[PDB]
Amino acid sequence: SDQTWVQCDACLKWRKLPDGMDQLPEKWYCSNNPDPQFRNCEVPEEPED
Amino acid sequence: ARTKQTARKST
Ligand SMILES: [Zn+2]
16 A cells, blocks of 8 residues: 655645555645644654555 | 555554
C-alpha cells in the first residue's frame, strides 16, 4: 500500500492522510487535518521516504 | 482536493 497525501490549498504543503480517507472536500487545508500535529500551515512538510 | 500517492516501504 502507498501513502496518500493531500495538498493544503492555502500554504501548498503536502500532508499525509490516513489510509482509506477516500472522500475529501473540494478544497482542503491544514486546519482540517485529522492529525493535530500537522493542523497548522506553519508546521513544515514531512519528508518523503 | 489535490492528492498524490508515494511509496511506503513499511507496507
Ligand atoms: Zn497549510
